[PDB]
Amino acid sequence: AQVQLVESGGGLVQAGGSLKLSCAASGFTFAHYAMVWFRQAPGKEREFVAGISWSGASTYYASSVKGRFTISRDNAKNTVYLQMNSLKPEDTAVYYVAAARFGVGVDDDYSYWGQGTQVTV
Amino acid sequence: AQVQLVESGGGLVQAGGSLKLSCAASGFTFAHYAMVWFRQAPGKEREFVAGISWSGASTYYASSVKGRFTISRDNAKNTVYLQMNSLKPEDTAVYYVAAARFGVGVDDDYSYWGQGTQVTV
Amino acid sequence: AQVQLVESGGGLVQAGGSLKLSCAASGFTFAHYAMVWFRQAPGKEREFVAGISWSGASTYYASSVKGRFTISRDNAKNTVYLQMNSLKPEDTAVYYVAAARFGVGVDDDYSYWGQGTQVTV
Amino acid sequence: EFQRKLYKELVKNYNPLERPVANDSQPLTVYFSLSLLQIMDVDEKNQVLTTNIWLQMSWTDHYLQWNVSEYPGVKTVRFPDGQIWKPDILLYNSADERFDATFHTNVLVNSSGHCQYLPPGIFKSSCYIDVRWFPFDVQHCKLKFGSWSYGGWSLDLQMQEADISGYIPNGEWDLVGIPGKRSERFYECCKEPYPDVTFTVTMRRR
Amino acid sequence: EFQRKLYKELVKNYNPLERPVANDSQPLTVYFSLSLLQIMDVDEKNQVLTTNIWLQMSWTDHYLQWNVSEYPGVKTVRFPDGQIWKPDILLYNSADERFDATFHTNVLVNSSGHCQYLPPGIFKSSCYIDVRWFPFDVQHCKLKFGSWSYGGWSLDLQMQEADISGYIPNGEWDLVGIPGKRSERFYECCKEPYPDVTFTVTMRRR
Amino acid sequence: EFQRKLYKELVKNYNPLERPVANDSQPLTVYFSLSLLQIMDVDEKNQVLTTNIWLQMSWTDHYLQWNVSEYPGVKTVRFPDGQIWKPDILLYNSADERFDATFHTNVLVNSSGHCQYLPPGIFKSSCYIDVRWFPFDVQHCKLKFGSWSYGGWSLDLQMQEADISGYIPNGEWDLVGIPGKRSERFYECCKEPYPDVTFTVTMRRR
Amino acid sequence: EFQRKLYKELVKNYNPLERPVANDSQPLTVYFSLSLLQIMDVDEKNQVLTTNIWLQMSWTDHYLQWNVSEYPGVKTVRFPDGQIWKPDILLYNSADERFDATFHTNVLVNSSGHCQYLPPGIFKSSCYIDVRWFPFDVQHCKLKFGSWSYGGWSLDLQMQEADISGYIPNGEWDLVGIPGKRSERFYECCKEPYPDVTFTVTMRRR
Amino acid sequence: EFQRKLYKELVKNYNPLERPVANDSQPLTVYFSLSLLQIMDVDEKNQVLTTNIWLQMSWTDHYLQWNVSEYPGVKTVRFPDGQIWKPDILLYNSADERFDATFHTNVLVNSSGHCQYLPPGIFKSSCYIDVRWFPFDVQHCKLKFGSWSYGGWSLDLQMQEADISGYIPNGEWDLVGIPGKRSERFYECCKEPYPDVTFTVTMRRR
Ligand SMILES: *[C@@H]1O[C@H](CO)[C@@H](O)[C@H](O)[C@H]1NC(C)=O
Ligand SMILES: *[C@@H]1O[C@H](CO)[C@@H](O)[C@H](O)[C@H]1NC(C)=O
Ligand SMILES: *[C@@H]1O[C@H](CO)[C@@H](O)[C@H](O)[C@H]1NC(C)=O
Ligand SMILES: *[C@@H]1O[C@H](CO)[C@@H](O)[C@H](O)[C@H]1NC(C)=O
Ligand SMILES: *[C@@H]1O[C@H](CO)[C@@H](O)[C@H](O)[C@H]1NC(C)=O
Ligand SMILES: *[C@@H]1O[C@H](CO)[C@@H](O)[C@H](O)[C@H]1NC(C)=O
Ligand SMILES: *[C@@H]1O[C@H](CO)[C@@H](O)[C@H](O)[C@H]1NC(C)=O
Ligand SMILES: *[C@@H]1O[C@H](CO)[C@@H](O)[C@H](O)[C@H]1NC(C)=O
Ligand SMILES: *[C@@H]1O[C@H](CO)[C@@H](O)[C@H](O)[C@H]1NC(C)=O
Ligand SMILES: *[C@@H]1O[C@H](CO)[C@@H](O)[C@H](O)[C@H]1NC(C)=O
C-alpha cells in the first residue's frame, strides 16, 4: 500500500523567467484516476488552479489564468507536469494535488490528497 | 463519562529524537474499534498522521511520515503505541487520538474523542 | 433586486447609554416576514441576539441578554426598533438583521440578509 | 427566472403536517362537494355498490400569499402530493380492500391564496339492496364522508350542493335525487361536535 | 406560530426504532380493543372467512410531552407513518394474499402523551369449519391478535371489551356473542412469557 | 468523459414541478398522437372496453440546451420518471380501478431540442354501447384525452392523426377507422379555454 | 438514554450491502427451517399448489456487538427492512405473479448474538400433478429453496427439520411426512458447491 | 473490512444514468439469452399465452474495476436495483396489465467488470391462434425483445442460444424448439439501425 503523492519544484525565482514542477504516484492506478491542482494561501483557503481528465484531453483552467500555465501527464512515468510561464508577483502560495476517480476537472469528490510545495516569486 | 482517554509521554527534544507515545481507554470493548492519531497546530486544520484498523494489519501512514513514524496496538494490554524516530523540528503541535467503529483508518465518522499531549521541537 | 435592507444607529458609547437602533426594508411584504438580530465580532463567527415572530407576540432573546434590550416593530411604517439599555463593553460587533418567512424567531432558514452597523464601545 | 424564484421561496418553512391559519384557536372552513359521473354496478343482495365520483375540496391558506406586481405572469401554482397539506376526509362505510379510491392529484393555488382538490374515484360502498316488495321499490343508499382524525373547533366541514351532469342514463336504474345532510356524531362527554356529511342516492328500478 | 414551533421542536431526537419509557427495564402497557362492523361471507370448501373490523390501540408515550400553559392553542398533534413509533400487533392466522390489511392512518397525541391508533380493516382469516353435520350448530371462529416480535417484560398487552354499536344485520347468519380472552405461552427455556388475545365469533345460522 | 459532465451540469436547478418556457405569458405547444395496436375486448353490457394503446407526446424545453460541437459523441440524453417535467395529460372516461394504467417511461432529449414520452398501456374505457337498431349496428365509442391541472393559455394541446399499423386482426369485430377531433369546449367563467382531444373508434360487427 | 445512545451508535459504518465476517475468505453459516401451517388447494391441471408457511432463517452477525455490563436493560434490539442485512433465500420454481409473497418483517438481535428473520406467507408453487396412474396415488411435490446470488465459499446454508404443529387437518388431503434434503449443483468452470434445499410434501388423498 | 472499503470507495462518482464506455462513439455490446421453464396456459380466443421465463443479460463495464492483489478475499461485488446501470430491455408485444413482470434482482460484478442481470418472470404475451385450415396444426408464437429508449450505434444487441432445460413435460402441448434471430427495423430518418431479437416458439398438440 503506502499511497502517497510527493511534490517538488521549490520555485522561489523572481518574476518572468519560468517554473516547472512535477508530481508522482505510489499505490493507485494512474490510468483510472484524475488529478487536479489546488492553491492554498495564508489568507485564502482553496482555488481550482487547473485540471485534466482520465481520458487524456480535457484540459480545464480557471478564469484567473487562461494562457500562462499548461499541464501535461504521462502514464508510463506515473507523473503529471505543470508549467508556469510569465511569473507574476500576485500568485504566491502553496500548491498541492487532489486525486479523484473518473472525473472532468469541475467540482468533484476526492479520496487522496497530496503534499504541499511552497512557491513564492 | 467513563469513555475518556489519557496520554503517556512527552516530547521536547531539539531534533532527531526518539519517542514512544502510549494511549489507553476504558468503558467500551477494545476489540470493535479502531484508533487514529491526529495533530492540531496553533492555527491550522486537523491532519491525519497514523492509523490502524481493528483487524490488526492495515497500517496507514501519512505521506510525510512514511519511513519515520510507526504505530502498533496491544489488545490484551488495552493500549496503543506510537513510536517516533528521526523527528523533524517542524512537528510542534498537540497530538490526540480519535476512535471509531469498524473501519480502516481512512476518512470516517469518529465517535469518541480524547485529549492531546503537547510536543515542542 | 429591490430587496434593500438598510440600517442606521452608529454609536460609540460606554456603559449606561440608551440606543434606538433602527432598521428598514422594502420590496417584500413586511407583514409576512419575521426578523431576528444577529451579532458578528472578529473573535467569533455569528451569534443570536433577539427575534420576533410575524405577529408580534412571544419575542425571543438569549441567555446573556435576558434583561436589558427590547425589540419592537410596527407594520404600518416599515420600521424595526431595538431599544438597547445598560451597555457593556462586550457588545463590540456588527448588527445585521435577518428576515425569514412566517417564523418563530428561534432558529429558522433565512431568505433576506442585511448589512453591518458596527458598534464599538 | 420568476417561476424558479417563486417555487424556491414559497417552501422555506412549510412542514406539511401543519394546519394553515393565522390564529390557531380559530377553526378552519373547508367547502366540500361531490359530483357523480357514472354508475358501474349496484349488484345483488351482496350489499355492495360501485360508483364513479369526482370529489371537490376547497379551502383558504394563509401561508401561500403574494401579489402579481412583484411576479408578472404567474397566476396558478401547482403542488403534488407530499409537499402540501390536504384534509384527510374519507368514506366511513367503505368496502374496498384498499379502503381508499382516491387517485391523488396536484392541488392548484391562486395568487391571494385558495386551494382546489379534485380527485376522481371508483367507490365501492355498502348499502341494503333488499327490494322484496315486488320489483318496484325505491332504494336509498348512503355515502358517509368525514374527517378521520380532525374534529371539533378545528375543521367545520361546510357542504355545497351536488352536481347533476352527464350521468350516462342507465338501462336498469334511475336516480331520483341526491340530497346531502350534515350531522354530528357527538360522543357522551366531549363538549366539541364531530361533523360529517351523508349523501343519499335514491333509485327504484328500470 | 406556536404549532409550527412545536412541530419543529418536538422531533429533536426521536429515532423511530425506540421504545418510549423512562426506565428501560420497566415494561410498557398497551391497551387493545376492536369493533366489529359487518360480516361479508364465509366460503365453505376452503377454510376462510371475511370480517370488517376497526382496531383500537392505546399507549403512553414519554418523549412526546409538553404543557399547554406556554403553548396556547394546539391541544392535539397528528403524526403519519414513518416518524412515530407504533406497536406491531398483527393477526396470526391470516389467509389473505397479504399479511396486513390495515389502512395506515395518523397517530394522535395530547398534552403529556396518550397515543390512539385506529386502523380500519377488511380482515380475511382462516377458521375451523367442521360443523357440516348439524346445520343448526354454532360456529366458534377465532381471531388471534398479538405482537409478532415484541413480547415479555416489554409489552403487557391488556384487553378491553368488544363493541356492539352497529352491525348491519346479515341475511344468512346472526351474531350470538363476541367473547374475548387473553392467553400466554411460555418459551422453550425462559421466564419471559408471550401474550396474545383471542376473540371468538359465534353464529348459528339464518 | 463528457456524458458524466453533461448529466451533472444540466440538473443544477431544475425543480421538477416547474413549467419551462422562455416567456411566462406565452403558452406552450404540446403535440398528441396515439397509436392503437390492438383492441382486447369490447366486454359485456357494462359499457367497458379494453384496448392496447401506445400514446405519444411532444413538447419543447428551454432549460435543456447545449452545443454538440464541444461534446462529440453524446447527442441524446434520457431522464427517468421523477426528475424531468412531464405533462399531466390522461384519459377522462376512465373505468380502471387505478385510473391511470400507464407504465412510466424515460424521456428523451436531443441537442437543444424536444422531448418524447412513449407510454404503453391497456386502457379500460367506457363508452355508449346502446345500439339504436337491433344488436347488429355500428357503434362509435369515444376516448377523451386532456390535461387535468393544466388548461387554457398554458398548453394549447394539438392533435395529430392516429396510426393504422399492425392491428392484429381480431376474430369478432372489424373497425372502419380511427378519426380524432380537437375541441376547445368548456369555456367557463374563467376567460381561458379548456381544450380537449376526442378520438372515435367505430365498429359494427363481424 | 441507553436506548437512544445504543441505537445511534450502532450504525456508524454499516453499509447495508455487506457480508459480516471477521475474515473475508471464511464463509458464513445460515440455518434454514420452515413451518407449514395449512394447505390451501392443489388447484387445476396448471400444476400449481398453494400452502401457508412461516420460514425461519438464522445467522451470526459480527457487526452488532456489545455487552450488558455497561448497558443495563437493553437485551433485544430490532431493525427494519432496508437497513439490516438479510439473506436472499427464495423459492426457485415459484409460480406466483410477484415471485415473492414474503411479508417483510423486522430483524431481531440479542446482546452480542445472532439474528432471527421469521417471515410469514402463503406460497403458490408449481408441482407435477400427474398421478393419473390411479386416483389413489401418492403425489410428491417439491419446494426448492436456496440463494439467488450468493453461493459457494460464501454461504454454507444448512438445514433444520420442519415443524409438525397444528396443521389444521384438511378435508381432502392428508400428508405422510415432510422430509427435506440439501443438494449441490456443480458449475461449468468452478469448484464452488452451490447449495440448495428441497423439501418434499407427500400426500395420497382423504 | 476490505469489503466495506471497496463498497464505500467504488461509488464515488457513479451517476446512475450513465452508459459506461471508454469512448462515447463506440457502441456497447449486450448479450441476451432467455431460458423458459414451463408453459402455464394458452387461454382462449383473446390470443394470449402465459410462460415462465428467466432472462440472462451480460455486458462489460468500465467504471467498476480493481485487482484482487490489494483487496484479498472479495471477488464478486453485488449491487441492488437503482444504484447500478441496467439496460432498458423489455418485451414489445406485452399483453400483461403491468407491462413488466420482471422481479428485479441484484447485479453481480467481478474484478474486470463483467456483469450478469438474470431476472425471473411470468410473461403473458399475445399471439395469433387462428389456424382455421387445420385444427391440428403447429402454432408459431413470436416474442419480440429489444430496447425501448436506446437504439442504434449505442447498444448493439447480440443473441445467444436459448435453453432447453427441464421444461416440466406438459400435458396438452409439446414444443419442437425455440429458434431465435436478430432483426432490424431501420427508420427512414437518419441511418441509425433499430435492432431487436425475435424468438419463435413452435408447438403442436399432445
Ligand atoms: C463488559 O464490558 C466492560 C467494558 O468496560 C468490561 O469492563 C466488562 O468486564 C465486560 N463484562 C463482560 C462480562 O464481558
Ligand atoms: C405588492 O406588494 C408590494 C409589497 O408590499 C407592494 O409594495 C405593492 O404596492 C403591491 N402591489 C399592489 C398592486 O398591491
Ligand atoms: C387569537 O385568538 C385568541 C382568542 O381569544 C386571542 O386571545 C388572541 O389574541 C388571538 N391572537 C393571537 C393568539 O395572536
Ligand atoms: C428501574 O427499575 C428497577 C427495578 O428493579 C430499579 O431498581 C431501578 O432503580 C429503576 N431505574 C433505573 C434502572 O434507572
Ligand atoms: C409549563 O412548563 C414550563 C417549562 O418548564 C414551566 O415554566 C411552567 O411553569 C409550566 N406550567 C405549568 C402550569 O405546569
Ligand atoms: C413576453 O410577452 C410579453 C407580451 O408580448 C412581452 O411584453 C414580454 O417582453 C415577453 N417577454 C418576457 C415577459 O420576458
Ligand atoms: C456553441 O457555443 C459555443 C460558445 O458560444 C461555441 O464555441 C460553439 O461553436 C457553439 N456550437 C455550435 C454548434 O454553434
Ligand atoms: C484470513 O484467512 C486467510 C486465508 O489463508 C489467512 O491467511 C489469514 O491469516 C486469515 N486472517 C486474517 C487475514 O486476519
Ligand atoms: C474515440 O473515437 C473517435 C473516433 O472513433 C476518435 O477520434 C477519438 O480519438 C477516440 N477517443 C476519444 C474521443 O477519447
Ligand atoms: C495489482 O494491484 C497491486 C497493488 O499494489 C499493484 O502493485 C499491481 O500493479 C496491480 N496489477 C495491475 C496489473 O495493475
Author numbering:
A (entry chain G), B (entry chain F), C (entry chain I): 1 to 121
D (entry chain D), E (entry chain E), F (entry chain C), G (entry chain A), H (entry chain B): 1 to 206
Question: What did the authors write?
Answer:
2D class averages show a minor fraction of particles containing one or two bound nanobodies and a major fraction containing three bound nanobodies. We selected these later particles to solve a C4partial-Apo structure. For simplicity, we labeled the three C4 according to their position in C4-Apo: C4 chains F, G and I sit above α7 chains A, B and D, respectively. Interaction determinants of the three C4s with α7 are identical to the ones observed in C4-Apo. C4F and C4G interact with each other in a similar manner to C4-Apo, although through a slightly larger interaction surface (~260 Å2), while C4I sits alone. Therefore, data show that the nanobodies can bind independently from each other but that their orientation is constrained by the presence of neighboring nanobodies. The C4partial-Apo structure shows that C4 binds in a sequential manner, a process requiring significant reorganization (change of radial and lateral inclination) of already bound nanobodies to accommodate new ones.
The human α7 nicotinic receptor is a pentameric channel mediating cellular and neuronal communication. In this study, we solved five structures of the α7-nAChR in complex with two nanobodies, unraveling a common epitope at the apex of the receptor, which is formed by the MIR and the N-terminal helices from two adjacent subunits.
